[PDB]
Design a binder for this molecule. Sequence first.
Ligand code: CA
Length: 94
Amino acid sequence: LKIDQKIRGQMPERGWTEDDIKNTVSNGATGTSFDKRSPKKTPPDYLGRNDPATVYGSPGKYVVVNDRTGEVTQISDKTDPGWVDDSRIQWGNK
Ligand SMILES: [Ca+2]
């Protein structure tokens, strides 16, 4: 699992400690998404991403991880009961 500066900054704002993220991931995959980032959106490497990603956790309380790199790409705000889940996430079994 890899946590970049962006995610580290969001963690306390969104109610996630590293242990919380690890526990949610260990609970098992709950859906799928993608890590499709343009080159400029991937500092400091600037290589870009076009990889499958897996969702862990539940609606309003989830984390998304790049399947190839292990990078946490998105985390929901668990401190906002009204968090709007990314509608593009494919939950459960297809
Ligand atoms: Ca911020």
